[PDB]
Each structure stands twice: as C-alpha cells, then as structure tokens.
Design a protein around this nucleic acid. Structure first.
Lengths: 103, 242, 310, 48, 73, 96, 90, 241, 144
RNA sequence: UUGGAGUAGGCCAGCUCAGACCGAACUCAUUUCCUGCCUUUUACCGGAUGUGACCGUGAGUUGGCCUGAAAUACUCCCUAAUCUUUGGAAACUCUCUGGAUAUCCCAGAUU
C-alpha cells in the first residue's frame, strides 16, 4: 500500500495529505510532501445577519517529510493512486499487385 | 456427425502440437553395434562388383579421413583402462567411422591418475629384470587386417597398469579411481554429458596426495620473479636472454 | 490521382514470417499492426513511415489463430491452437498472462471495444469461453454440441455471435446462457462474423464461397438476411477467412483462395475491387479503422500486402 | 578514479576535480575568485 | 527483546529540571535510572504553577509519569 | 555439516553456495557473519574530525595569511556561501 | 527470529545531526538539531527552539523527550531520498 | 596452498589433451647438475610456451558449423557405441581401402600398397609408369598419418590379444610417439612437422631424466606417453584444414 | 550502478559536519587498495561483472583504484587515487567519505605527502605478519 | 507469511550472442616485409606485420527425446503489565480570551 497518495486522520482531528513512503509494525508512518489541513469550526457573525454562521475553515500548512507515531494515528484514506521491445527480422518492400484476375 | 469428425481430425492433423512442420518428429537414435559390424564385414576390401555404387562415395570420404584420425587418436584408452567404448558416427556404406566423443576429464582426477601411473611404471621398471619392448611395426606387412569378431570380440583382456590403492588411506577414491569416467553416476557431476564436477575435501586431499610426482611444490608467486611471461617478452624485445 | 494517403509507397509488402499468416489486426487508431502466424509468432509493425518491424512476441507453443487490440492499443489478445488464450504487454514486449480452460483448438475470440472488458473464445471442443482480462480462470463458458469457428460481441455487450459447422449463425445471450435466435441460411462452415461499425449489419463468409450481410437491429422481419454477395471463390484449403468492414460501413472486403481480396459495395452488392497480389489463400482482409483508404491483406504466402484504394 | 561524476556544484570542505584550469599549476596552487566581495587581497597556502 | 536503555549517562549527577504531567516541575540531581525510564533523583524540589518550591529529597518518577527533561548545567 | 553449524549460529545460505570453492565460500560466510564495514565508519566518525573541526588547524598550519580576515572566517567555518577558495595539489591526466 | 526495526524508526535514527522539528502530544513543537536517537523514539535535541500552542515561544538547550509523549516529527528533505528507501531486491 | 586445480573443490571438465602434466617442470627454473642436452631441451620448451603466448589470437568464431553434428543430420550417417579397438581397426581398414581404390582407379595396379601403408612397385617400372605413378604430398602425407595411426592401433591390438602386457603397451605407445621420424617418413611431405618431432624429443629428455633416477635403470620401460600424445594431437588439429 | 543515490550523495555534500576526509596509507602491499575494494564492492553493484570472469582473471584482485597502466602491469599503486562514497554507520546513518588511496612503495611516497595535505584523518593500514616497515615509519613520522 | 505468477531432472538438436580471459590448453595456412639456407621450384629456417581456417568453450533462447511428478507439493516476489494495540477513560461545569456584544450559543484554553 506504499507510494499511494493518501490522507490520514490524527487523533487530534488534524488531517495530513501526502505520499505514504513507509510504514512500520507499530503503524508509525513516514510520509513525504505532507500537507497538514485542520478544519476548525468558526462562528462568523455577519454585520447584517444576526445568525452567526458556523463554517469549517480549513487551514493548510505544508510540512514536507514527516514521521508520525502509530499511537496517535487513527485512520487513513487513499486520495489518489500512483502518478524492452526488441526489433525482429521483418522487412518492408514496396511491390506490385501483379496481373489482373478474371471474375 | 461425419462433418464434426472430419473437422476435428483435420484441425488436429494441422494444428496439433506434434506436427509443427507436418510430421511427427523424433530424436535420432543409436543403432546396434552389429549393424556397423555387418556393414564393414560385408564391404570388406571393396573388391566385389556388388559395391560398385559405393565406390565413389568411399573414395570421396578420403577427404574426411584426416578428421577421423584426429577423433580416433584423441579418444585413445589411457593406461589404466583395459578397454574403452566410444560413440561413433558411421557412414552406412561403412566408408567412414568418426569417433563422436570428446575425451573430457576432471583435471585433479586425470592429474592424480597419471601421477599414480608415474609411480607404478617406475616401480615396475625397478622390479622387472629384462624389459622386452614390443616390435615395431607389430604385424608383418602382408598379413590381412584382424577382424574384430574372430580375434578380439570375446577375448578377455590383460591387466592394465593400475596402482595398489590402500583401502584405509585412500578410502576417498578407492571405489572409483580407475573407472572410465569417474563419478559419472554420482551427485558429483551434472550428468552423463560430464561437464562440471564438485569433489569433497577428503576426495580432493586424496587426489592431491596421489599426484605428488607431478604436482608443483611452488607456493610463493615470487618464485617466478624475472622468469615469467612478461620478463621473457621484455628480454625478447631487447635481444637479451635471462 | 496517383496516391492519396500517408504511406511512403502505394504498396508495401511486409514479410518476415517463416510460416503462414492467419490473422492481422490494426490498432484502433490505425497506427500499429500485429500479425500472428503458424511459426508461433506475433510480429508487430508500424504502418506509417519506413514501417519497421519494431517487435516480435514469442511464447505460444502452437499456431496463433487470433489477436485483438485493447481499448487504447497497449494490450494484445492472442488465441492459439495450444488450447490457450494470452494477454500480452506492448510496453515491454513481454507477456502478461495466459488464459487456460479450453480442451481443443481455439478458432475465435473477441474483445468488447466499449462496455466492459471480456474475451470471447470459440473453441473446437464446442465451447464459448467468456474471460476477464485480469484473472486466468474462465469467468464463464457456454456449451454447444458443435465446434465454433466464429464469434462476435454485440454492440450492447450481452449477445454472442457464434458460427459453427452446423451452418447457421447463432445469437446467444450471456445472462441466460441460451441461444436467443439463429440466422440460418448459410450452406457451409462459417468463418468470420464482424459487426458493422454503426452496429446494424453483420458480415458472414462461409466455406460455400458466399458472403452474406444480415441484420442486427431489434426490429427486423423473420428473414434478417440483407444480401448474399458472391465473387470470392474459396480455394483448396479450408482456412478460416477473415473479412472486415470499412469505417463508413460501405465496403465489404473478404479474402479469397486465389490470392485476391474482393471488395463489394455493402449498400447494393457491386464488386468494387478484386485486388490481386498473393500466391496462396488470403486469410485476413482488413480496412484501416481511422477511415483512410488503407487496406491490409495478410495471406499464407507468409506475407502481408498493405495497399491503397484510390 | 575509475570514472568521474559531473556536477554543477561542489560545496565547501570537499574534494573536487577541475577541468580547464590546469595550464598554470606546476606543483601546487590555490584557486580563488576573480574579485572578492570586499575587494580584499588573496594569499596562498604553504608549499608542500 | 529487551528494550535499549536511554542515553542518560552524561546526565548523571547533574542538575536537571523534569516537566511531568499535571504541568509539574521537579528540579533535582540525577541519581539513577532503569530500562523502563524509572528515574530516581536526590534533593528534589517540586514546583506547581504557583511558583512555590517544596523540598522532597529523594524522589522517584516512573517512565510514563516523566514527560520532558532538561539539564540545568 | 556446514549447513547445520552455520544455521546453528543463524547464518543461512542457498544450498548451491554450500558446495562452492573454499575461498569463495569463505568470503560468503565471513560476509554474512561480520556484515558490512560499519565498524570502519564508526571508527572514522569517532576518531577523525570533520572539516569544520579541522579547518582551523589546517589554516593555522598551512595558511600564510592573517586569521582575523573575513576570508579566514570563511575558510575556518567552511561556509558554502563564502567566496571560492580551493587548495589544489594533485594533477591527474585525462583518458587521453 | 531477527528483530526488524521499522523504516520510520530508521529514518529517525538517520536524521541525527540535522535540524528537525518534533511536536509532542501536549501541543508544543520544538525545532532544533537532534543530538541522539533511540529505538523507542526518545530523542535529545540541542538547539531546541520551543513554541507552545498557547502562544509560548522560548529557547532551551539539551532537552530530552520520550517517545510516548512525542506526536509528530518532521526531518530534513534530503533524507527523503535516503539509501534506506531503496527496495533491496537480492 | 595447493596449485591449480588442487585448491578448488568445483570446476568444469577439461579435455584430456588440455591437461599439460609436466608444464611446470620447464615453467620453473631448471634443477642444478643437468646434462647440457636436458637444459637446452628446457629452453626449447620454454621458447615454445613463450611463442604460443605471444601469438595469441582472437578470431571471433561464429560462422562455424561442426562437421560431426552436420553429418549426424543426414540419412547416410548413423550412430552407435563400439569398442575403441574396433573403431581403430575399422579406421585403418577404411583408409587402406580408400588409398587402394585411388591407386586402382588411376590404373596403377603395379604399385602394391601393403597393410602397413608402404607403397612399393611390384615390378620394374618404365619411364611412363614412373611418371604416371609419382603421387603427391596429399596422398603421401595421408598415407604416413595413416601409418602412425596403424602403429598405435596395432599396439593396442597386440595388448588386447595377450601378446604384450600393459607395461609393454604403454612403453610401445611412448616409443611410437617419440619415434615418428624413424617409424614414418611423414616429415618428407611436411617438413614443418619436424618442429613437433623436436618437441617430442624435448619432452622425452625431461621425462627420462626424472624417470630413470635412483633405482630405475636404463633401456626401455618409460610409458609416460601423455605429453607426446598431446603434441601429435595438436599437430593433427592444425593439419586437418 | 551503485547502491546509494547520487542525489542523496550530492545532498550530503551540503552538510559539512557529517563528512570525513581520510587517507589510507601504509607500506607496500599491505592492503590499502584491497580495503578500498572492500568498500567499493559494498557500495557498487559490480559483483555481477566480476562473477562472469573465467580463467586466471577469475583470481584477479579487483583493484578499483589502480587505473594507470603502470599500476595494472606492475601490480602496485603509483598514484594517489581519490574516491567519494556513501558508507553506513552502525546506527543506520549514512555518511559521505572522501577517501584517498595512497601508494605504499617507498618511492611514490610524495603522493602520500600530497594526500596528507588534503585529508583530515589518516587510516594507517598495516600488515599483521610483516608489521611495521620503513614506509610505515615514514608515514607515521609525517602524520604525527 | 500471503496473493498472483509459476514449474522437474537428465540428455539431443537448431539459432543468436560472446575473444577481455571465450581455451589456466594450444596447432596450421597466409598478405606485405626482413633474415637464414640455397643451382631452380616445392618443401623449409625465424622474427616482424596483418589476415584466414581448424580443434575446442561459455551464456541466452527455441524445438524435440528420456525418466518421473500429477491439478500435487515446492518455488517466486512482498510486508491484555511503564514507550506505539487490549485506552487515566468518559462526562459535564467553572474561570479566562476572541466573535456576537443585552443574553443564549460557539471556538480555543484551564480545572
């Protein structure tokens, strides 16, 4: 299941998307090109509307190559998959189709 | 139903995996030795008129006789063999008999066998009183050639030159030392084609001990200082001699 | 009007097989050529340019009698008289895998061009095997009582066009594993069933030297037989002649046993061409799928003639 | 030794092989930039 | 097999501050340790968030109880 | 017997390799017993200084300029972003 | 049998001497040059610039952290192409 | 610490002639207290080794079909397994009948070719008979090669008949291979052959001076015939084309 | 083809604290190039080409850093030959080693002297049977 | 350990590659020269320089033969007692900060 672009969910609710490079026996996962996205719920109150809208703002920070312990790892989901003809003895010669044949 | 039978038969007789070429093909086999024996006996010296069709070919096989001489003398029996059998490729007129073999040996085994020959011949020459050398040529000129069947076919041969191997000291090679192709039916060679060998440490030690009169006692390569090939080539290029 | 195409010569003779060619197919973009022949070999050529034999595929233990291309043209599909199917990779020239489960000689096969990927093999034990091109085991197989020499997949992907030595085209359904209906009318052993590119006509040449075009459409009379073209007599050998359609569905090209490939007009039944050029029987006569006037005729002269239709 | 790996840059404190420069070295040499950033002088290492 | 012992031989008999769970601080001198990070220290002074230092003397902290450590010398 | 003994220690070889010549079998056995040259790497790391810890000594011994200049600090700390200085001593002839 | 350590533990062990950022489970992340490592991920750092999620930025020297409280670790990019990642096919 | 191949425990088989049993005798320094003839034999053998090494070639053989394997593919050649002595007797009779048919086809029946391969006129020849009969170097070189082959085969046959013992057989084989110039006129039709003759004498010197040492006396008895046999095999290799 | 990555090796040039520059030095035929062959055969994938050798060249020592024709024919090193390698410590951490093989003959020892200007450490290879000889004394005296 | 991929040993024959060392061994012919011996030519002498043939070799692949094995077993590639998995968990409130700002609510932090 290595080298597949996946997103893993941490125990603190933070998501990490990237290419899974290696995994161990205790599920300690080392992944490269990691982007940590946190979906924090914020109650933004408009100046004209009295109802405050609860929006899940996603803050994304690029970390790079990160190794995470398996005790704080919760779950992961795959996002995207991964991203000798020898020459024979044949020859080609122009030719002609020969004499016309009766029906 | 006749259509199904004839279609299946046609399809098999055209696309079966035994007829890739149109005919059932086999591997060329070995005739009895008595076939060649009868042919050579029948043609004799080519003096009957029956074999007038066989004369042009026979005289034309003169061209390949040198090559037969090479193969015959190459596959000669060694002194420890009373007799040897060889595969021959023979012409069906009896014109040519080419020995179809390569005298392929294990180098430690061959080297030790010939070293034991050196020992045995020296001991016998020290033990014999008067050594009668054989006459050359062995047979008088006007004698007809010896037929195999009447003269040699059933005759028990004499004892070959072999050394009295000690049963206890030479127990590694005792049972196979003087066989024709030693260890051919063992897990010590790849098979009957006899092309790779492996020998255990006791066997290699025993073969090293038996080859003492021949094997080299030089261990240090520094023994060959200024007496190696590059030194001889340098001395040749310089018109000097070591 | 000397020459109107992209080939560097109006005729090219592709040679290099040491045995009789039985099939030859085009890449569905009209760019690559695959020919399987009785010397157990699939030779892979370019059609545009200097036309080098860029590849040879070995690995069948007996005569090769069919091959289709994939959707893109990256995986080849070879049926062979070693009772086997095989899927081949053209990125490396190696073999992906072999499909096993037939007991006698395999004559036909078909890949579903669009729909879901299935290989459809007619084999002389009396079987029509439906295979998935990822597992070597047969997904299913339909039992008949006669050898099958012809097979085509429907446009809807569930009807099977079998043709046996029992002299009639049978349309089966995969789900019920039973024959839907038989277009009878032929007198001799069926060889090729190729659906029309639009999908309403079926070409069928049999050993009686007559090539008939039939209906495919669900609304049709009792006799679905459109036309019986004649003019391509079959020779001495009882080969499995493989005809084809043009891209526009207007021209019918079938090889013949005199070395001549015969093209009729599918609309009316007029002999458009009677192109000579071969010594033995012509086994596989095909059009260019791109729509160019390129025709290919692979014959058991160990040769292929790649020519033009001006 | 058996071969050479061509690269666009060899950093400080390492071993380097330079080609196109040999015309002036006779026993030992010190290779520096054309002009320093502060316009300072240049000094040589001790002879071997 | 048996887990590897922590690399704290240079930290022996030195002033160290250990932060433990409950946001507690312990300032002391290292006296010994074990494979399971059971640290025994002498002249320990415990500090809560109020900043009050209470002397305890010889104290022991388990491996799970120990969170962070830092040498004071 | 060799298979039994080396499996008793925990060294495993393919059965074709157990029948090799004594010198090559010896090389394979010692290679799988001792392993790679990590001990030499450890010895060099522990007992031989890095360029950062030896460049000051190199400047003190074999450099004829003053040590208070910025070029001296650049040579001493082995910075990449400093100006170029290379001490060339050896000359190797090319392939031709 | 022979005990096989994880590839991620090997990448942590090979990261010694380069600056890495370790964030514990307490919300505090310290970035500094790692000076040691262990099989139980108990790492000691020397530069240790610490930032706590309550907003506390500080600097400390020679701080040792056990592997239990350590949540995430980020190492240098060069070790992304390390010799460990090559699939050995003997 | 044994020399090759005694420090190995696995290997490939070599041909029997491709084992030089005494090459290290002259590849090493000569022992002290030698006769001058033995020393110059050592030097001559070393010269042959050096000149073989200097003219080592790289012919790039790929266009070579075997004679025996191509002959096996026909209907006119079959295969069997027979005794070596039977094959030698057959080869000698075949070559004799071939030369006899050639002589009789040219209507030269006044020349008798006897069974030891000597061509002698049965009567006094005229000038035209002598002119028509003079044979060539191909006939005569083949006839003397056949004569040496006959000598070797009759040595083996005399062993197989009980007339000589095995030590006598090995001694006779060594004698025949060391006395080709005396027992044949084979040098008459190819004089470069004398090189081979010289080589055999050189080997004999070495062999004798290590054989007749100690209680071993003089005269016949030396059956160490392998190196001379090798020399004549390599001659036949070159003389075949 | 080697068993490390050249991009990884170039990136480990970028960290000059984990780099060691050493010179292998010692007497004639005491095993400097044999040591370097050990390192090379650990890193480079050239066992496949060496296992195809036959004849007397099957017994030839590789001698990767003997490349002058003098060195191949005389059988001794005459030029200080440099290499760069990636070698792994017991902790699994890879290090870039810039090593110099020096000649051991008592005449080419100036090459040794040249290498002793360039390196930070001296790995002195000494035979256990012959022990310390005159060039070992000269190299030890200089490096001390 | 698993999935899928597979398939025995010996011998025989074809084809392609290999000279660096195919060969731990070793012959012959020959072009252009130099030299020896020679009345002439063949046959020779012995160094250079190339160029051919022969006796053999290895690896890959393809077809067949022999004997077994019989959908077998084997092989291939790959990964509940202190620090990662048998949870000090769960639950809610208080206080503080921000948005709203009269409150409810929510985020974050703490008990």
């Amino acid at each position: 299941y290595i080298n597949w672009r996946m997103r893993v969910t941490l125990n603190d609710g933070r998501q990490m998307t990237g290419q899974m490079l290696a995994f161990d026996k205790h599920m300690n996962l080392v992944l490269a090109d990691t982007e940590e996205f946190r979906k924090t719920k914020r109650m933004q109150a408009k100046p004209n509307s009295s109802t405050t809208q609860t929006l899940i703002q996603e803050e994304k920070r690029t970390l790079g190559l990160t190794i995470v312990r398996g005790a704080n790892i919760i779950a992961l989901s795959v996002e995207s998959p991964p991203p000798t003809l020898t020459a024979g003895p044949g020859v080609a010669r122009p030719a002609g189709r020969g004499a016309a044949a009766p029906i | 139903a006749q259509k199904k039978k004839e279609w299946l038969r046609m399809q098999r007789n055209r696309f079966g995996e035994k007829r890739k070429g149109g005919f059932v093909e086999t591997q060329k086999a070995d005739m009895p030795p008595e076939h060649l024996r009868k042919i050579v006996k029948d043609i004799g010296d080519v003096s009957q008129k029956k074999y007038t069709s066989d004369k042009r070919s026979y005289l034309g096989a003169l061209k390949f006789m040198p090559h037969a001489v090479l193969k015959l003398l190459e596959n000669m029996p060694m002194p420890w063999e009373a007799a040897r059998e060889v595969k021959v490729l023979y012409h069906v007129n009896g014109c040519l008999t080419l020995v179809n073999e390569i005298p392929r040996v294990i180098e430690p085994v061959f080297f030790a066998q010939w070293g034991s020959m050196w020992r045995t011949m020296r001991k016998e020459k020290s033990d014999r009183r008067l050594f009668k050398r054989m006459r050359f040529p062995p047979f008088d000129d006007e004698e007809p050639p010896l037929s195999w069947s009447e003269n040699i076919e059933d005759v028990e041969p004499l004892e070959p030159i072999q050394m009295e191997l000690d049963e206890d000291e030479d127990a590694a090679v005792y049972e196979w030392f003087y066989d024709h192709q030693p260890l051919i039916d063992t897990p010590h060679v790849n098979g009957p084609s006899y092309k790779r060998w492996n020998l255990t440490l006791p066997q290699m030690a025993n073969l090293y001990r038996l080859s003492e009169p021949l094997v080299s006692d030089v261990v240090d390569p520094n023994y060959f200082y200024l007496f190696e090939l590059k030194s001889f080539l340098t001395a040749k290029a310089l018109n000097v001699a070591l | 009007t000397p020459r109107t195409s992209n080939l560097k010569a109006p005729l090219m003779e592709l040679s290099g097989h040491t045995g009789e060619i039985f099939t030859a197919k085009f890449d569905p973009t009209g760019t690559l050529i695959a020919s399987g022949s009785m010397d157990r070999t699939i030779m892979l050529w370019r059609v545009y340019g200097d036309c080098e034999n860029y590849g040879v595929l070995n690995g069948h233990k007996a005569a090769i009698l069919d091959l289709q291309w994939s959707r893109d043209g990256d995986i080849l599909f070879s049926a062979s008289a070693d009772m086997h199917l095989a899927s081949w990779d053209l990125t490396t020239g190696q073999r992906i895998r072999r499909y096993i489960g037939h007991e006698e000689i395999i004559n036909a096969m078909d890949v579903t061009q669009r729909g879901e990927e299935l290989l459809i093999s007619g084999s002389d034990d009396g079987t029509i095997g439906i295979w998935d091109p990822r597992t070597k085991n047969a997904v299913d197989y339909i039992e008949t009582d006669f050898p099958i020499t012809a097979v085509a997949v429907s446009e809807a992907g569930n009807e099977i066009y079998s043709g046996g030595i029992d002299n009639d085209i049978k349309v089966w359904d995969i789900r019920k594993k039973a024959v839907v209906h038989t277009m009878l009318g032929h007198n001799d052993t069926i060889t090729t069933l190729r659906v029309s590119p639009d999908g309403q006509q079926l070409l069928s040449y049999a050993m009686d030297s007559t090539a008939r075009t039939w209906d495919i459409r669900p609304f049709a009379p009792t006799d679905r037989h459109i036309r019986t073209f004649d003019g391509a007599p079959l020779g001495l050998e009882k080969n499995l002649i493989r005809g084809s359609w043009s891209k526009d569905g207007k021209k019918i090209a079938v090889g013949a046993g005199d070395g001549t490939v015969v093209i009729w007009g599918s609309d009316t039944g007029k002999l458009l061409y009677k192109l000579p050029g071969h010594k033995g029987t012509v086994n596989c006569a095909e059009f260019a799928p791109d729509g160019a006037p390129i025709i290919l005729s692979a014959s058991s002269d160990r040769t292929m003639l790649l020519g033009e239709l001006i | 030794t058996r071969y050479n790996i061509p690269t666009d840059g060899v950093p400080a404190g390492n071993f380097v092989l330079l080609g196109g420069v040999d015309n002036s070295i006779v026993k030992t040499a010190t290779i520096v930039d054309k002009k320093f950033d502060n316009g300072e002088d240049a000094y040589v290492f001790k002879p071997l | 097999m048996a887990p590897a012992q922590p690399e704290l031989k240079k930290y022996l008999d030195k002033r160290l501050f250990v932060e433990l769970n409950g946001s507690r601080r312990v300032i002391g001198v290292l006296r010994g340790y074990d494979v399971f990070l059971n640290i025994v220290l002498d002249d320990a002074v415990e500090e809560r968030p109020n900043g009050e230092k209470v002397k305890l003397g010889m104290v022991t902290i388990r491996g799970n109880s120990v969170v962070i450590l830092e040498p004071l010398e | 017997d060799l298979k039994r003994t080396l499996s008793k220690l925990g060294i495993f070889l393919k059965p074709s390799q157990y029948k090799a010549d004594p010198k090559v079998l010896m090389k394979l056995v010692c290679e799988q017993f001792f392993g790679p040259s990590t001990a030499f790497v450890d010895m060099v790391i522990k007992h031989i200084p890095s360029p950062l810890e030896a460049a000051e000594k190199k400047l003190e011994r074999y450099y004829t300029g003053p040590l208070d200049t910025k070029i001296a600090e650049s040579m001493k700390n082995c910075d990449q972003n400093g100006p170029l200085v290379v001490h060339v001593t050896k000359l190797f002839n090319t392939i031709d | 049998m022979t005990s096989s350590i994880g590839i991620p533990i090997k990448l942590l062990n090979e990261a010694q001497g380069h600056i890495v950022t370790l964030e514990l489970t307490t919300g505090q992340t310290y970035r500094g040059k790692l000076i040691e490592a262990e099989d139980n991920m108990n790492v000691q750092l020397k530069d240790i610039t610490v930032t706590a999620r309550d907003g506390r930025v500080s600097h400390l020297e020679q701080i040792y952290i056990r592997g239990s409280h350590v949540r995430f670790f980020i190492v240098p990019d060069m070790l992304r192409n390390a010799p460990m990642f090559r699939s050995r096919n003997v | 610490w044994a020399p090759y191949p005694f420090d190995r425990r696995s290997g490939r088989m070599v041909r029997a002639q491709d084992v030089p049993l005494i090459k290290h005798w002259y590849l090493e320094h000569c022992p002290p207290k030698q006769p001058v003839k033995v020393r110059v034999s050592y030097q001559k053998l070393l010269k042959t080794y050096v000149l073989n090494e200097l003219h080592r070639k790289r012919p790039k053989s790929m266009q070579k079909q075997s004679l025996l394997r191509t002959l096996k593919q026909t209907k006119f050649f079959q295969q069997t397994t027979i005794d070596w002595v039977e094959a030698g007797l057959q080869v000698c009779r075949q070559g004799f009948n071939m030369l006899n048919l050639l002589i009789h086809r040219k209507n030269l029946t006044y020349l008798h070719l006897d069974y030891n391969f000597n061509l002698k006129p049965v009567k006094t020849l005229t000038t035209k008979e002598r002119k028509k009969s003079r044979f060539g170097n191909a006939f005569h070189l083949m006839r003397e090669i056949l004569r040496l082959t006959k000598l070797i085969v009759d040595a083996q046959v005399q062993y197989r008949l009980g007339n000589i013992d095995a030590f006598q057989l090995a001694d006779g084989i060594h004698y025949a291979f060391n006395h080709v110039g005396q027992l044949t006129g084979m040098y008459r039709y190819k004089y470069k052959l004398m090189h081979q003759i010289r080589s055999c004498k050189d080997l004999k010197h070495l062999i004798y001076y290590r054989f007749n040492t100690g209680p071993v006396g003089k005269g016949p008895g030396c059956g160490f015939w392998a190196p001379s046999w090798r020399v004549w095999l390599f001659f036949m290799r070159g003389i075949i084309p | 083809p080697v068993y490390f990555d050249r991009g990884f090796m170039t990136d480990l040039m970028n960290f000059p604290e984990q780099i060691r520059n050493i010179a292998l030095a010692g007497h004639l035929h005491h095993g400097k190039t044999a040591f370097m062959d050990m390192l090379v055969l650990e890193t480079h994938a050239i066992q496949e080409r060496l296992d195809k050798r036959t004849g007397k060249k099957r017994d030839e020592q590789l001698r990767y850093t003997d490349v002058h024709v003098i060195e191949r024919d005389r059988g001794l090193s005459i030029k200080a030959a440099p290499m760069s390698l990636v070698l792994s410590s017991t902790k699994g951490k890879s290090h870039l080693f810039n090593i110099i093989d020096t000649p051991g003959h008592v005449d080419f020892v100036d090459e040794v002297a040249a290498a002793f200007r360039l390196v930070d450490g001296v790995c002195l290879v000494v035979d256990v049977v012959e022990g310390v000889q005159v060039n070992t004394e000269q190299i030890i005296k200089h490096a001390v």
